[PDB]
Design a protein around this ligand. Structure first.
Ligand SMILES: CCCCCCCCCCCCCCCC(=O)O[C@H](COC(=O)CCCCCCCC[C@H](C)CCCCCCCC)COP(=O)(O)O
Ligand SMILES: CCCCCCCCCCCCCCCC(=O)O[C@H](COC(=O)CCCCCCCC[C@H](C)CCCCCCCC)COP(=O)(O)O
Ligand SMILES: [K+]
Ligand SMILES: [K+]
Ligand code: NA
Lengths: 414, 415
């Protein structure tokens, strides 16, 4: 059976990363911030919070709003996720040295949780007020959930496929998994991949709040997101979007690109357990991590580091601890970045994949914020307090989505 | 030499069961008979919303048998429409397959859709605007999320080897079958339910596509309106559908005694990077999606006896696809455009047309393309028309293209 280690798949490397977060618009600054213990989570000051008296009054808006970079035409003729895709795809391409690739070997794979949904409600209101001829001629292309990937594919010139996998909170990781598949199956030599997501707004907060999934520690915003802590009380929104450039090691060498890490293998499984709760036993989630190892050609004993999905729900973190045990990965050093950056839904697995890469590049794991009282059910080596330095070689990034979706990505130091 | 189905580098994958609901029939076998008899599912729309809004489009095909006549009280309150359609088709498919006892850890679901449970977005929005955040359902997130129908089916049927939802607008239903074939041939699953679901004809969808000037407005003769490849075409017509198939390795089928209907041999996915909604005129990357499906199957273009065209009956789309079929070397295939009779079901349609391609191979017959009356010289294809065309069809390609520049081609063969 082919694996990356045995040469049955070609070697695939990560050659550039870009992200915008609640800490910074610059991924390198976000990273320095994380290592210094910074949080992106603050009191929400939006008028919508008081207008509705929302139960949730905390979150991390982007440090640098996407629309501060957008012309007036884009603000009207693109949905928000498309604008985010255009901004991040252009940034990534510049970071990569604007390479001249063969468009016919270049794919784009970008996940998102929903798509241009503000344009659904806009079109509905316009039609209700004015009739069907008031709906924009650009409404379909702004709404369709493949819209952001399609904008990026047209902008950068990708003709080897433009794919949008949707798996709710695992979408951003799933996108990188399918990009890796598209390269190792021989359909592309280079891909832009990752995830984008909309901003914090009143209706998204109402819907998730009514699920009772969210922290309401509004008193102390930076202390609210507590993955694996005994006193955790649910997740916190933190806006983001993230893309990375991956390509065959061959392709990278031929253009002189310096790899940041290796993308070794990807596992996708599902729970068949519940529409929003993850299976308590962690078994299928663990098998996603095992599958990524099998395709990489690694054993769980090789794994140095897990970047946890770690949302800070009581049931979600308990299930993930079980998953990491099922996969034999519970001796590894664990980081839960949502402690600092909060949860960006369809973007978050992509953001956390970029963080995994930077851990491997720099030999360091940031502290998991708010990790103060260990939970006996969890029993994981959670990095906390100070950043932890080490010669990390191999890491798994976990992401799980409502609907029972498990995605694990195996990364290696270059 | 690289793996193909023909050289055994990929395992053999067979289609073992199919289910669809359409404007002609809730029964796929009765849909197929109807198509062969020249039936159309397109009629005048009778909905109050047409006259409320004075819509410029007044034709389309609603399902013959509405999904919600089969839904219980709780289903109507806990699922979006595409999830209800997914639960209904998933149970029908499983029964049609003999309710097999498969290993859940080797069983995947891959179901595409164009949008998701979007009616629950506008419902939630209205509820909150009237009554505040506490009026939003605690089920709103799971009903809205576009992976929702695939997740309902995966939970219903017990699939633990992955549940995926590729979105590529009007190619989503074919792209789902492509990713299901990949999940099997990469070794992640031995059996998969896959296809596509989509919402019903409603005013707001009509309004949005008719503002693109994309739709036929031949209201006085509804069965004559959808005219793919015809000189006098004037845009697409909505026809509701949902469709799923069961695929599995040949070994898995044989061990449980399943009778295959056809083989699924390979899949190509490319993109145009040309325009956000118009397909590239030159058909080059769409042709490459067909060629790639042939490479992975281990076929040559001369092997392809039949192409089931995406054929939406837009002036631009049909011309690009004819070019693409020529680029792929497949323009001596017999061509069927089923949207002529069933209309366009957006995220479902590639899956429905994949089911029809399987049936053409199983039965050795292509239905007539309806309304094909005046050949267009920029098209130059062998379009089946008038009576069905019979033959021992050995291999076929199904095409589907989506706004955003997405091209998907699926190669199938006779079992
Ligand atoms: C990290 C947060 C993640 C949230 C993810 C939630 C899903 C994201 C959906 C995209 C949101 C885009 C919002 C951008 C528009 C914007 O900014 O416009 C505001 C005005 O508000 C609006 O238009 C509200 C728009 C509401 C749109 C419908 C949202 C429906 C949400 C569902 C009921 C709940 C979430 C479903 C998630 C399912 C997928 C993942 C499991 C300023 O406008 P102005 O007056 O200053 O010009
Ligand atoms: C073959 C047609 C394909 C259409 C494809 C459109 C794609 C989206 C389909 C989703 C539609 C689901 C509707 C089912 C619910 C239902 O039936 O609710 C009616 C009442 O109306 C409504 O709630 C209408 C609410 C509409 C929801 C928003 C739709 C937004 C459409 C966009 C502006 C335009 C299309 C975007 C497509 C992008 C993806 C593909 C390129 C029963 O009324 P009652 O029982 O309450 O009396
Ligand atoms: K993670
Ligand atoms: K077709
Ligand atoms: Na006849």
């Amino acid at each position: 059976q082919p694996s990356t280690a045995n040469g049955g798949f070609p070697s695939v490397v990560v050659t550039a990363v870009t992200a915008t977060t609640s800490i910074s618009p610059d991924i390198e600054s976000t990273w320095k911030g994380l290592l210094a213990g910074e949080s992106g989570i603050h009191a929400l000051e939006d008028e919508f919070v008081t207008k509705w008296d929302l139960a949730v009054k905390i979150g991390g808006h982007l440090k640098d709003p996407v629309d501060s970079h957008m012309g007036r035409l884009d603000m009207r003729r693109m949905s928000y996720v498309q604008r985010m895709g255009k901004l991040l795809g252009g940034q990534l391409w510049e970071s990569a040295g604007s390479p001249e690739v063969d468009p016919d070997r270049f794919a784009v794979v970008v996940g998102t949780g929903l798509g241009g949904a503000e344009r659904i409600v806009e079109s509905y209101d316009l039609m209700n007020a004015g009739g069907p001829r008031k709906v924009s001629p650009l409404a379909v292309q702004m709404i369709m959930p493949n819209g952001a990937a399609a904008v990026i594919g047209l902008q950068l010139g990708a003709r080897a496929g433009v794919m949008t996998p949707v798996s709710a909170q695992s979408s951003g990781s799933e996108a990188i998994a399918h990009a890796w598949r598209q390269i190792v199956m021989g359909d592309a030599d280079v891909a832009v991949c990752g995830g984008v997501e909309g901003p914090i707004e009143a209706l998204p907060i109402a819907a998730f709040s009514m699920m009772r999934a969210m922290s309401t520690r509004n008193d102390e915003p930076e202390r609210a997101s507590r993955p694996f802590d005994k006193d955790r009380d649910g997740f916190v929104f933190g806006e983001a979007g993230a893309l990375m450039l991956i390509e065959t090691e061959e392709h990278a060498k031929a253009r002189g690109a310096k790899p940041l890490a290796r993308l070794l293998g990807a596992g996708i499984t599902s729970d068949a357990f519940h529409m929003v709760a993850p299976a308590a036993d962690g078994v299928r989630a663990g098998r996603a991590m095992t599958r990524s190892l099998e395709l990489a050609g690694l054993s769980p004993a090789d794994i140095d580091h897990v970047n946890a999905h770690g949302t800070a729900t009581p049931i979600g973190d308990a299930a993930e601890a079980n998953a990491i045990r099922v996969a034999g990965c519970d001796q590894a050093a664990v980081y839960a970045p949502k402690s600092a950056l909060g949860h960006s839904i369809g973007a978050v697995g992509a953001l956390e994949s970029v963080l995994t890469v930077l851990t491997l590049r720099d030999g360091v794991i940031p502290p998991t914020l708010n990790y103060e009282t260990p939970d006996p059910e969890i029993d994981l080596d959670v990095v906390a307090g100070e950043p932890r330095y080490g010669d990390y070689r191999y890491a798994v990034n976990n992401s799980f989505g409502f609907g029972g979706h498990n995605v694990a990505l195996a990364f290696g130091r270059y």
